[PDB]
Design an enzyme around this catalytic site. Structure first.
Site, PDB file in Angstrom:
ATOM      1  N   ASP A 142       0.788  -1.153  -0.046  1.00  0.00           N
ATOM      2  CA  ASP A 142       0.091  -0.121  -0.084  1.00  0.00           C
ATOM      3  C   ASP A 142       0.988   1.178   0.132  1.00  0.00           C
ATOM      4  O   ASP A 142       1.443   1.710   1.138  1.00  0.00           O
ATOM      5  CB  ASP A 142      -0.860  -0.080   1.119  1.00  0.00           C
ATOM      6  CG  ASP A 142      -2.014   1.073   1.246  1.00  0.00           C
ATOM      7  OD1 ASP A 142      -1.878   2.019   0.111  1.00  0.00           O
ATOM      8  OD2 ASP A 142      -2.705   1.047   2.014  1.00  0.00           O
ATOM      9  N   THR A 143       1.002   1.913  -1.300  1.00  0.00           N
ATOM     10  CA  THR A 143       1.687   3.134  -1.350  1.00  0.00           C
ATOM     11  C   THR A 143       1.124   4.074  -0.669  1.00  0.00           C
ATOM     12  O   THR A 143       1.798   5.323  -0.365  1.00  0.00           O
ATOM     13  CB  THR A 143       2.192   3.370  -2.842  1.00  0.00           C
ATOM     14  OG1 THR A 143       0.951   3.524  -3.520  1.00  0.00           O
ATOM     15  CG2 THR A 143       3.081   2.295  -3.321  1.00  0.00           C
ATOM     16  N   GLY A 144      -0.139   4.118  -0.461  1.00  0.00           N
ATOM     17  CA  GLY A 144      -0.973   5.200   0.327  1.00  0.00           C
ATOM     18  C   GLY A 144      -1.036   5.329   1.630  1.00  0.00           C
ATOM     19  O   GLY A 144      -1.369   5.956   2.461  1.00  0.00           O
TER      20      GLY A 144
HETATM   21  C1  LIG Z   1      -2.441   6.810   5.710  1.00  0.00           C
HETATM   22  C2  LIG Z   1      -1.841   6.026   6.865  1.00  0.00           C
HETATM   23  C3  LIG Z   1      -1.142   6.444   7.515  1.00  0.00           C
HETATM   24  C4  LIG Z   1      -0.492   5.447   8.563  1.00  0.00           C
HETATM   25  C5  LIG Z   1      -0.762   3.918   8.419  1.00  0.00           C
HETATM   26  C6  LIG Z   1      -1.761   3.492   7.518  1.00  0.00           C
HETATM   27  C7  LIG Z   1      -1.963   2.259   7.216  1.00  0.00           C
HETATM   28  C8  LIG Z   1      -2.056   4.377   6.554  1.00  0.00           C
HETATM   29  O1  LIG Z   1      -3.051   3.970   5.658  1.00  0.00           O
HETATM   30  C9  LIG Z   1      -4.530   3.827   6.123  1.00  0.00           C
HETATM   31  C10 LIG Z   1      -5.529   3.795   4.815  1.00  0.00           C
HETATM   32  O2  LIG Z   1      -6.722   3.485   5.122  1.00  0.00           O
HETATM   33  N1  LIG Z   1      -4.925   4.313   3.721  1.00  0.00           N
HETATM   34  C11 LIG Z   1      -5.856   4.462   2.437  1.00  0.00           C
HETATM   35  C12 LIG Z   1      -5.588   5.544   1.466  1.00  0.00           C
HETATM   36  C13 LIG Z   1      -5.727   6.745   2.660  1.00  0.00           C
HETATM   37  C14 LIG Z   1      -4.896   7.365   2.889  1.00  0.00           C
HETATM   38  C15 LIG Z   1      -4.845   8.882   3.714  1.00  0.00           C
HETATM   39  C16 LIG Z   1      -6.051   8.925   4.334  1.00  0.00           C
HETATM   40  C17 LIG Z   1      -7.139   8.049   4.147  1.00  0.00           C
HETATM   41  C18 LIG Z   1      -6.963   7.041   3.196  1.00  0.00           C
HETATM   42  C19 LIG Z   1      -5.556   3.053   1.473  1.00  0.00           C
HETATM   43  O3  LIG Z   1      -4.285   3.116   1.073  1.00  0.00           O
HETATM   44  C20 LIG Z   1      -5.709   1.774   2.256  1.00  0.00           C
HETATM   45  C21 LIG Z   1      -7.084   1.303   2.386  1.00  0.00           C
HETATM   46  C22 LIG Z   1      -7.273  -0.114   2.714  1.00  0.00           C
HETATM   47  C23 LIG Z   1      -8.525  -0.709   2.976  1.00  0.00           C
HETATM   48  C24 LIG Z   1      -9.238  -0.631   4.150  1.00  0.00           C
HETATM   49  C25 LIG Z   1     -10.478  -1.117   4.505  1.00  0.00           C
HETATM   50  C26 LIG Z   1     -10.981  -1.665   3.384  1.00  0.00           C
HETATM   51  C27 LIG Z   1     -10.735  -1.746   2.202  1.00  0.00           C
HETATM   52  C28 LIG Z   1      -9.172  -1.364   1.947  1.00  0.00           C
HETATM   53  N2  LIG Z   1      -7.846   1.579   1.111  1.00  0.00           N
HETATM   54  C29 LIG Z   1      -9.066   2.058   1.168  1.00  0.00           C
HETATM   55  O4  LIG Z   1      -9.520   2.742   2.161  1.00  0.00           O
HETATM   56  C30 LIG Z   1      -9.828   2.229  -0.146  1.00  0.00           C
HETATM   57  C31 LIG Z   1     -10.424   3.817  -0.545  1.00  0.00           C
HETATM   58  C32 LIG Z   1      -9.032   4.818  -0.229  1.00  0.00           C
HETATM   59  C33 LIG Z   1     -10.794   4.165  -1.791  1.00  0.00           C
HETATM   60  N3  LIG Z   1     -10.930   1.462  -0.261  1.00  0.00           N
HETATM   61  C34 LIG Z   1     -12.274   1.496   0.657  1.00  0.00           C
HETATM   62  C35 LIG Z   1     -13.165   0.892  -0.150  1.00  0.00           C
HETATM   63  C36 LIG Z   1     -12.983  -0.684  -0.361  1.00  0.00           C
HETATM   64  N4  LIG Z   1     -11.755  -0.624  -1.131  1.00  0.00           N
HETATM   65  C37 LIG Z   1     -10.783   0.257  -1.077  1.00  0.00           C
HETATM   66  O5  LIG Z   1      -9.748   0.119  -1.761  1.00  0.00           O
END
Ligand SMILES: Cc1cccc(C)c1OCC(=O)N[C@@H](Cc1ccccc1)[C@@H](O)C[C@H](Cc1ccccc1)NC(=O)[C@H](C(C)C)N1CCCNC1=O
Lengths: 99, 99
Positions: B25-27
């Site tokens: 996860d690059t995000g």
């Molecule tokens: C930002 C951060 C800081 C410290 C530590 C961590 C793990 C951090 O990341 C936490 C985070 O949720 N980052 C998201 C993007 C982020 C960065 C900064 C702030 C907020 C969000 C994204 O990359 C990962 C996360 C994973 C996920 C979680 C639950 C269900 C499904 C997928 N992916 C999602 O939420 C996506 C959304 C973005 C379209 N998503 C949700 C619908 C189902 N499928 C899906 O793919």
């Protein structure tokens, strides 16, 4: 280009004729942008990530240029904390992870 | 290897003697794993997602093997629905975004 990950992979995007900064997010299935005005019809959708769910407006077949690479796909608009470019568009610009 | 983004970039990881599937996860700034019982001291932390925050336990200098590539750094543990490998560890395995 090749982008290292010591910093957030933020890049300039162009959507609806406006320039924005967005995050290349391989952990996102979808593209979600902060609140904005986009033309065309939309459908109310909800997505659940870490922390819970949010209400978003789904725009289909939206032109969006990512770092000079054009894409046309689904763009969600809602109260996201950061502009996120998800895999639906990352695939269109030929993005891959490499190590 | 090279990992396309047509599907979620899930890979096998080894941590604390256990094999798991985790999302590259690059995000994600940091790494957060599904609830597990790691030994040693930890510090409370809260991380934000798209819908809000979750409370996690921060463990420092934890070894993780990602696709045979070892890495040592901070590992968060909490009620995450998915195992997430964040930039803090992606950099250590030489992971880049390419398009
Ligand atoms: C930002 C951060 C800081 C410290 C530590 C961590 C793990 C951090 O990341 C936490 C985070 O949720 N980052 C998201 C993007 C982020 C960065 C900064 C702030 C907020 C969000 C994204 O990359 C990962 C996360 C994973 C996920 C979680 C639950 C269900 C499904 C997928 N992916 C999602 O939420 C996506 C959304 C973005 C379209 N998503 C949700 C619908 C189902 N499928 C899906 O793919």
């Amino acid at each position: 280009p090749q982008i290292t990950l010591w910093k957030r992979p933020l890049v300039t995007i162009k959507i609806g004729g406006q320039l924005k900064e967005a995050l290349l997010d391989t952990g996102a299935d979808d593209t979600v942008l902060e609140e904005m005005n986009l033309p065309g019809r939309w459908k109310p959708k909800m997505i659940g990530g870490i922390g819970g769910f949010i209400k978003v407006r789904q725009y289909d077949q939206i032109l969006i240029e990512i770092c000079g690479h054009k894409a046309i796909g689904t763009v969600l608009v809602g109260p996201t904390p950061v502009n996120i470019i998800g895999r639906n568009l990352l695939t269109q610009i030929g993005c891959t992870l490499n190590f």
